[PDB]
Structures are given as C-alpha cells and as structure tokens.
Symmetry: D3
C-alpha cells in the first residue's frame, strides 16, 4: 500500500481488494444463521420477511431470544409469569410461519437483560455449538433507542461473535468439547438507521404482518391501530432506498470496521 | 396505510394523523410536570427560564434531584457531607425564585448514580404517586457529555416513564396502593444538541442567571468569569434558532420514536 | 458577554478569549503526559508517531495500560496467563523504540475492564502521583467501536481527569499525602472520527509500523496482510486533513465542552 | 448498674428489668404479623401450625414471598414460567387453609434472590405500609443451610426491620406518604437450630401436612416418602423441648442482642 | 412416621431407613469424583492422601480449580501472570503424583472468585458433562476461615451440586445437549472442623508432603519451616479421632440436611 | 515434627515454638496500631478503654472509619448529610479524650459498605502508607451480628491485612512508591464472643462511657437508659474472665489459624 497516492484510493483498495468486501449478495452462501432478538417478536418485526426468504432458500434459521417478555402487558390481571408462558407460544406459532424450527430461550427477565461477561458466555456456548455462517442482531447504535434490552442485545451479540473465536474466552466450553466459533461468518444488524443492504419484502409484507400479529398479547386492536402504519412506514423507509415499496434494512461491514475505524460512515 | 404511495407521505400521515405530533405548543395542556436533574442546579441551568414561565402560567413544577452534589467543590475545607447540606439549601432558594415548591431528593451520591433497576424503581414510585402530565430530563445522547450522572439520569428517566406504565414492573408499588403511571402526555429533553422546540427566555435571562448564582458553592466569582459567558453563549445558540436573543432548547418526539425507529432525524 | 450581538461572535470570543482555546500548538509546554491504552499495543497503534515526536522533544511519556491482553490469541496451546506475560515484554520493547520509560499496568483482564468507581480510583491515584500536563485516551464516542474495553477506557479517562481534581473524590489519596490533580492540563482523544488536530507522521510511519509489529503475538503474517493496509489507510485518512501522506488525529476541546454543551460539533 | 456485683447478676437485671424480656407469651398482643418466606411453601413448612393458631386468635397474617419458585421442578417439560404460575395458585390454596388473606409477591427469581439495598427497600415499603406488630423470617444462622435464598431472606428481613425505622433509609417512601416503621414490634426466626420459644402444634399437625401437600408441584408421592418423615422428625425435635409430640420452634431475642452482643447463647 | 414414640427414635429411623445414611464406607461405590479446589494446591493439601487412595483403588479423580493462584507470592520479581503459568505446571506435576490426569481450570483470578450465578453455571456445566458419583469441596462453615475464595468455593460447590439437577437452571446447557446432573451419590467436605469420616493417610503422609512441596512457588524452605509442622499437626488432629497417626477429615451428611435442618449436629 | 507423639504435644509446640504465639503481652512493642471501625463510635464502644491504655503507653493509635454514620437517627428533620457532618465532629471529640490524633474516613454510606475488592484496596493503601504494628477490627464471626457493615468490616480488615502483603495485589500502590505491608504485625478482633485476651478497663469504665456519650446524636437519654446497662453488662462479661469488674475482650490467633485450620477453638 506504501505506493498509493490518496486516502480515497487507499480506502477503495482496502475495502475491495484487501478486505474483499461487497454487498452484492451477502447472505448467498449461508447454510445456518442465528437471529438474536431482545424480546419475543423482535426477529419477525425487524426481519420477518428476510427470515422467510432465508428459509425458502434452504437456510436453517435459529432464533436466540434474550428475554422472556415478562413485562409486556398493561393488563393488571396477567402476571409476568403468565405472560412469559403465553409469549413462548406466540413466538413458536410466529416462527412456524417463517420456517424457523429451533429457538434458544435465554430466559433473562424483560427489562433486566444484564450487560455482562455472563451473558456473552451464554451467546458464546450457542455460537460454539451451532457454528452459524451468519448472525443477525439489533444495531446498538440506533439513535434514540431507549430500551436497554435492545442496546445490550446488539452490543453483546457483536462482542460475543468476536470473543467466542478466542480459546481463552469462556474456556470451560472447550474443556467440555465445543470448539471456538469458526471465522469467516458475517454479522448483519437490523433495526438500523444506517442500512447498507436492503431486502425487498414487498410481496412478503402481508405474511410478515400476519406473523407479527400472532404475538396477540402485544398487538390487540387498539395498539395495532398505531403499529400497523408505523411498521408499514418503516418498511417504506427501507424499501425506498433501493426503489421498492417495502424493504428490510441491514447494516453490514468488514470485521475490522467494528474497531478503531474513523471512516465507518463511508459504507 | 396499505394504499399510500411514497415513504414521504406515509411519514407525514404517521406523524400528523396516527401520532398527532405537534411542536407548536407542546406544553399547552400541562398542569403538573417533573423536572428531573442529575445534580442540584441542573434544572435551573438547563431550563430555569422555562420553569419560571411554567410556574407563572399555573403549572405545578416538581423537581426530582437524583444525586446530592457531594463532589462539587475544590475547597479542601468542605467535606462532601457539608457540601451536600449546603447545596440542599441553595437548591431550595433557587427553586423558590422560579415558582417551585417541591423537590424529591433521591440522595444518590454525586459521581455514583447507579444505572440500575433500583434507580428506575425510585423514579417509578414518584411517577406513579404524582402522575405528572410531562417529564423533563437531560438528553442522554448529547455528544461528548462526559458526566455519567447526566447520561444515566437521561436514560433512566426515559426508561422509567415507559416502564412505570407496566403493572408487572416494580409490582410492590401496586400492592401498596399506587397505580401505574398513565397520565403523561410528554417527555422533553433539555441539555440537547438536537432541539426541535425552543422557548424564548430573553426577558427571563437575568433572573435565570440570578437563580443559578444562588448556587454559590458552585459559582464563586472566579468560576463565574467562565460560566457566565458559557451560559450566555448556550442561550444564544438556542435562541438564534427561532431568531431571539436567549433561548432554551428541548427535544420532543412521539413515544414510538424512542424505539426501533430509523428516521428519528426527520423531526 | 451581556452586549455581544450574534451567537457566531459569542462563540468565537468564548473559545479564543474566555477559554483561551488553542489548536495551533496544543502540546507546547507539555513536560509529562500519560497515554492511557485499553490493551498492550493501543498507544502505539493509535498514536505511536506522536509519542515518538513527544519523546524526541524531551517530553516524558508514561503509559497506563488498562488490561493485560489475556484474550488476544487464537492459539489453543497458549493460555491467557502465558500470553499476558508475552505481551508485557512486547510492550516494553515497543515502548523503548518510542522513547517511553514507564508503564503503569492496571492488570484488569482483557475483555473484562469494569466501568466503575474503582477503576476511576486507580486512574486518579496515578493522575495525582504523576501530575501530568496532558492525557491521551481513546474517544469513547467513536461510531461502531465494538470493544467494551475501548469505550470504557475513553469514558473512565475523561471522568478521572475531571474527578481527580476534586478533594472529596477518592479522598484516601489525599489522606496518604497525594494532592488533587492539577488544573492546567489538556485531554487529547485518539482513535477518533472527529479529529481537530493532526500530527504529521509521514516520516515516522515505518517506525510506527515496526513498533506495532513488535507485538508479534498480535500480528503474525496472515493478520498483518490485512492490518498493514488498514493502518496505512487510517493514517492517510488523518494525513489528508493537513495535506500530508500519513497523520495521527486527535480530538481536543476546552474542558467545559465535555459537559452540557450543544455545539461541540463546531470544533 | 454501677453497683451490681457479678456479670451473672447484671445479665439477669439487663434481660429482665432493663430490656423487659420474657418469652412467656411473646405473640400475645399481636394484631398483624408478616410471615416472610424465601419460596412458596416456606411459611407453611416452617410455621404453618403457628400461622393457623395466630389466625384463630384473630391476628391478621400476611405473607411476603421473596421469590417465584421458578426452579423447583425436575420435570423437563415444565418451564420456570409455568411452574411459577402453578406455585402462585398452590400458595393461595395453602394460605386459605391457614386463614391468610394477603400475600406480597416480590417476584425475585428462585436461586437468584439478591442480597442488596434494593431488596431491603422492597421489604421496607411493605413494613412501612402495613406497620405489623411482628415479623417472622428464617434464622440465617442455621448451620449448614445451603440455600442462598434462605440465608439472604433471613438477613434482609432482620436488616429491613431495623433500617425501615430510620427516616433517612429509602427516604422516597416518606416523600410519597409512608411513615417509618413503628418501634416495639418483635422478630421471631423460624427454621432455627437454637429455638427458645416453642408452639405446640400436635393437634394441628395433620392440617399443617395437608397445607404443605397442597404445594403438589413440590411434593409428589416419591418426594413425600422422604419429606413426610423428615417434617415429622423436625416437629418432634421442637416439640420434645417443651414435652409435647409436635412443635414449631422460634428464636426470639431483645433487639439489642442482634448487635455487638457476646452472650447471645445465654438465651 | 405417624406412630413413632420419641424424637430419638424418629431421628434414628430417618437416618438409617428413610435416608439410608452410612459413614462406614461412604466412598465405597465411586468410579468418578470431582475434587473442587479454590487454588492450585488445595486438593493435595486438604485431601492428597485420599486422592492417592482413590486413584489406587481405580477411581477417576478429576480436579476443578476455581482460580489461577495469581496473588500467591511475596516475590516482587514475579508478576501475577507469570506466577499463574508457573502454578499450572506445579499443579500438573503434583496431580501426576496422586493419580490425577484431568484438571478443569476455571481461571478466575485468585482473591477475586465471584459469588454468583455465573460461577454456579461453570460448575454446573462440568457436573452435567462429567456426571461424577461424588464431589469434594472445602467446608464453607469452617470457623475463622478468612479467605473468601475458600468460603465461596464451598458454598458454590454445594449449591451447584443441587441446582445442576434442575432443568430450568442454566437451561442453555440442556439446549446444547447436556443433561441435568443425576449421578451424584455424595458430597464430602474437606478442610472441616466437624468431620464425621476420617481417612487414615499415615503411610501416605510422606508422599502427600512431597506432592505439596511440588508447589515450589508456594513453599520455599523458609515458609516450609512453618507449614510442615502445621500440616503435620493438622493430620494428627484428624488421625487422632480414629486413633491413627495421620488422617484427613471429611464431613458428609444426607442431602436433606443441607436445608432447613435443625439437628445437623447429631451427625 | 516427624517424631512428635500426640496431637496435644504437636499443638503446644506449634503454638509456642514454631509460631511463637504469645497471649501474655500481645501488644508489647506496638508503636503504631490501626483501629478499624464500621461506624463513628465503634472503636470507643468496642475498645475505648484499651485505646486509652495504648495512648497512655505512647502507642500511636489511628482510626480507620469505614462509613459515615449517615443513617443513625430517627429525627425526621435531620438529613443524613447533616447527621454525617455532626458525627464526624463527635468522633473527633471522642477520639481526643482517648488520645487519638488521626482518623481515616473512608466515607462509604452507612448501611451500604460494599464487600468488594475496591474496599480492600482502600484498606490496603492505608496499611501500606502507615505500616502499623497491629490492627483491631470487629470479629465477623460474632453470632447474631445483624449489621452488614459490622460483618463486612471484620472480613475486609482480616483479608486486607493478608493481601496487602502481596505485591501483585493492588499493584498500583507499589507503582506510586508504597511498599507491601510489613509482615510482623498482629490482628486483634473486638466485639467477640470468643475472646482469648482481656484488657482490664475497671478504672477506665467511666472515661469509656463518657467518650461513648460524646456521640450525642446516637445516645439521647432514652436510648442511654438501655445502652448504659448494656455496655456495663458486656464489660462485665469480659472482665469476669480475668477476675475484674469490667474488661474489653479480644480474639488473637497466629496468622496461619485464619486459614484451613480445624482446631481454632483450642485457643
Ligand atoms: Na459454515
Ligand atoms: Na505541569
Ligand atoms: Na400495632
Ligand atoms: Na513496626
Ligand atoms: Zn424488543
Ligand atoms: Zn449536573
Ligand atoms: Zn485495544
Ligand atoms: Zn425455601
Ligand atoms: Zn487455597
Ligand atoms: Zn457500628
């Protein structure tokens, strides 16, 4: 590189030649992905359309759900325990619609997901057991995201993808037979303000809304009156970026760009 | 929303009709507001002119002060305990000047406010008892905001406004006779770099400055030589956005926008 | 400031006369600086060319390394204890090339640096012993920075530089004979997306790359094939800003701008 | 006291005259008591007989149950959420048998009860709201007690009885209208190895076993084969101390004896 | 048990018939045991003679070492990382002398073992994978035991033996293919003041001492001048209880006795 | 010791010759001691007469007070900050009567003293600065001691006296010029149920009661009506053990007996 003349030239050579980065078809070779959600419903709301397209292409999609959804009701006669048991069933039914056959429930309490080594170890045991080719999680840099379970899921997902590759990290996994997580897998962040890869979900939008409504405890009619237009407006926001009606947006970067990189806004 | 043509129209309808968002007169209907401050003096510094305006208009303003200002001196003759007691009296005088009669002191130690469910439960107990129409708090996304008590108070306030509405959150409150928070019409964030509502305080600026200086332990003459110009320049930065000499800046968004929203920069 | 007419004027006078803010020779008169790094290798990667220039000028540069680099290997036969001991000797060799004669090792475990009062106390005790004229640390607001040890080192460095000046903070230090940290000193943040000060390291770039590669455990040939072009590109991003081939970028602000300031993007 | 000749004389004068202590009929005047249990079933197993006798004497008995019992099954098809909802109903049915009409569920997860200020604040809000005349909890000094929820419930119960009297402790309770907890109430510790007050439960034993078996999720037939003889042997252990067939044991001391006291073994 | 006359008879039947407790030959049937130590060297110090006896009898003994022994030197030339690596090799040699081939190193830092659910999950993962017949651990009730790593390891081991049997505890273990712990027949506590089973090690004492001294960083000659007499006197204290020169003492109780039991002193 | 014949012999030689343990004049040669108290008033209540005797002998006695006594009032008009500042002056007056000229205030909040590494670091830094010949602290094994600040002060004092001697513990202390705590020094535990050393305070009892009552905020007349007889009775419990009317009791053991020792009750 010592002979390239300008930063602009170096950036393009680094991104395309050295890091081999392009977003033409980033999920192309995937056989198994994890979709990590803060609460029951986040995978389908954030990326339901893409989940169905992945299942249709013969990719095995597996959820990891960080919390139980215990707090998500204003009904005073429904305890958190009873809601959590109801929402496990809602998510099973929603997942069947999208082709998902396996969900890891971590069972942290809703509004209480910790931000700790302990939670990275839980994600790391699943990464190491399943060895996915790709991991989806919320973008923890989304502006004004006020829910701590969402920010923490996104930070702990990215951290655990990196650290789970390290054999001195949670080393008792390796002592019981698991290998470090394989290198070469992608991360794609949903619920992002800065998507650089859009999936067109226009003909899948009605199925995605149906699979969201199956979470009935969350979406009774009065709430749906505000949420349906909200969810459609979000999908148009992403779809407009590639000139289709409804889209799901993801942010994808080279691994090196998640650290010390001062020009992440160029992609 | 199935029929709408473009994202731009869906966004406009979402805001004006579905969410009925209006920045013309957001504090129009308030009768009781909480002003949440990290330290003794932040309510008057960030929003003292607006507090006066509100109290003058018949609005009951009630302070919640998260910490005791124990660390706020370079005077080696003044212990933290003695400074805290001094600052309680400074805040009482300062508040009297604006029209404020009630202060909840949570008494966390300055520089040590936790980011935790315990602190959410304290805010939640106050929200359920007082049932305010509005809540004001620092914007935890202010760039370069290096005081963890400021960032934490902002996140905790937004979080508690949300979760105090959920009956399974901090449930022992309901068990002792409190009801879920269900009065608020708004959150407004002060100390913000992205205000979208500006209150003109140009004729109240002298009183604001007087009410800040009531905090004498914080503003001896030598410190005031820097702070008076800084505070004036801040008030000019905000006032200039609506073409007035001195202003106070707030950011206000629809409740939905604090979660999963990728177009928050459009307001 | 009561009579100044525009925000733009007020701002220019606040910086240049009230705060005497200087981006022309910010490191002039520095006799002793601390360079706070999350891991062994971060001071040289982020700012090695500047550390050499400071050393060449007769400035005493002292490192504070937050963690031990225990996790930084994918070799299943190298334990973290063994890798930590390797990395300590690699940092000693790297530091000697750049003229650095002292390193404070805090010895927190890599990937496990706490965000706590305790860690501020450790920094504060060094600040009070050494009384440096300036401190360098990572910018904890770097977008997409996904290493918690980086974000937490930046926050805790900026917090400790402020709180170590307060006699009621970590008061047992003063009880054992240390004085509060002196008030004259700068902070400069490296690993930043918003530099406002660039040091030309075009001549020094090969010395920097050499001193980085002395951390051999971190940079075997396959990793260096990606990291050398990456580090050159980052240096060209900064260099271009002052018309030179390779630079190191820092963000420097007056102390007041690290709190409640809505116009930090104007510098 | 300065004229008493021997320690033995002083101890007896202190205990009987100064502290007015005797265990002739310690629950005699009680109108309202709290029975604080670590898990659903502990009140009935530890003190079911006495609870029924208190209800029969017209005392209002109120449970506080610290945890949800989420972990207490070996059935792999029953989630913790579903078990917790089942055990809420078991405890309601068990309590009806004993005359208990009110239970405060704190909702901490089984095996996860924290030992923290936060949990003392929850107990303190209930003490301050209910103003009981007496509080029962597990003796946290029971030798070989291996369950951390049991030790922590006993320590946090004693602590919260003391601290809830202090108006600077959890002061926001007082700001919303609650008074400090009234002085003069007793504490009695059950599950104790050093009882000094025994309640004869001989004719209540069959009712107590019935009210224990209503917790069916805990006591299927195979478990009951070991637990019935266990529970009978425990009751004989306590009953033998006063010469009856089945007893429930409590340890009761003067308040001063819970602190700095080197002769607690004399009672 | 309805018919039994006296507590004494109920106690005897409970122990011998209901609980089938026998201290004649408690390690009779073991094929695989875990020896859980706080630090490198505690298994050989507390129970090295018994470990040899077990390995000689065909029993597979597997160490779990909670911490890395990082603090265990007064040699200012030896960093914590270098000492840990030295102690791993000392333990491997020491273990080879007894018949031990496998060591799980959890790698918590010496003096810093947490008391937490995270540590329980590590022990739990090992218990579910190895399914040992017995577990040995320090007695956390040893009086005057001032090392928190010793108290914590004892409590955590007893707790994890229990909770690892519950499918909702650490559930992601089951999800990755592990089964609940359901093999153990026993816990035995060493380092105990209340042993009720004594192994004669009189002919193994020389080898025990040799295997302890293999930990050379811990036992240079000057320290050995005190430790050899202390270790010999300990072995005499235990051996004397069964009339032998040198012994090792264990406390063993029925599983029920670790909970709510008020007569644990009767064994 | 290979040839010694009975345990009893081995023990007597271990104490008297190997450990040179002396209960005859344990405080002889002490030039400087630290007296570690949980709250303002505990050094004088537990050991005020001994502190006077040490002072009279020309020993430099230095207090370390862990907490600020913020919670110790039932007066609803006295804030904790105001009470802390009162108690600091009450301790200064009390200490002057007993010849104490220096107090380290750690300023943790009463009822909130952490049990952590951080608090050990604070004690360690004082131990290393002052290098005392002996340390006094409460016995954290006192039965029924229900104040967490008492139990945690005792544990952390004993832990810090041991760990402050290790150069890898809190190593930044040595980096700033402090040496490891010297190895010659005693621990003596007050507030103990198992004293083995008693100081006769019969002459000093009125001075002790006076110096306790200088803590007026703690001892108004109604409280003193119970506390004076209680403190006299405690002193008579200790005194009787050496045939005097009033004493202070301490538990003193060789360093080794605070770890792994099953016969601590033999002294
Ligand atoms: Na693959
Ligand atoms: Na200087
Ligand atoms: Na009453
Ligand atoms: Na000395
Ligand atoms: Zn969610
Ligand atoms: Zn503030
Ligand atoms: Zn780094
Ligand atoms: Zn229980
Ligand atoms: Zn050990
Ligand atoms: Zn005390």
């Amino acid at each position: 590189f010592e002979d390239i003349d300008t930063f602009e030239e170096a950036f393009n050579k680094l991104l395309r030649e050295v890091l081999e980065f392009d977003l033409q078809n980033p999920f192309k070779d995937a056989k198994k992905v994890l979709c990590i959600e803060p609460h029951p419903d986040d995978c389908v709301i954030g990326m339901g359309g893409t989940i169905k397209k992945l299942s249709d292409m013969g990719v095995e999609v597996i959820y990891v759900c960080m919390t139980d959804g215990y707090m998500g009701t204003t009904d005073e006669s429904l305890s958190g325990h009873e809601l959590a048991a109801i929402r496990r069933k809602e998510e099973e039914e929603s997942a069947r619609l999208l082709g998902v056959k396996k969900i890891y429930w971590l069972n942290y309490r809703d509004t209480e997901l910790p931000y700790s080594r302990e939670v990275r170890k839980d994600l790391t045991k699943i990464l190491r057991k399943e060895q996915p080719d790709g991991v989806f999680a919320p973008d923890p840099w989304l502006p004004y995201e006020s829910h701590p379970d969402h920010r923490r899921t996104g930070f702990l997902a990215i951290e655990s993808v990196a650290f789970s590759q390290l054999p001195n990290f949670s080393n008792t996994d390796l002592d019981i037979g698991l290998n470090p997580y394989n290198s070469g897998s992608f991360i794609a962040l949903y619920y992002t303000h800065k998507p650089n890869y859009i999936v067109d979900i226009t003909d899948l939008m009605e199925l995605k809304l149906k699979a969201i409504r199956v979470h009935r405890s969350q979406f009774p009619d009065d709430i749906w009156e505000k949420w349906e237009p909200f969810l459609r407006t979000i999908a148009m926001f992403y779809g407009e970026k590639i000139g289709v009606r409804y889209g799901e947006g993801f942010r994808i970067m080279p691994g090196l760009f998640y650290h010390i990189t001062p020009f992440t806004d160029l992609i």
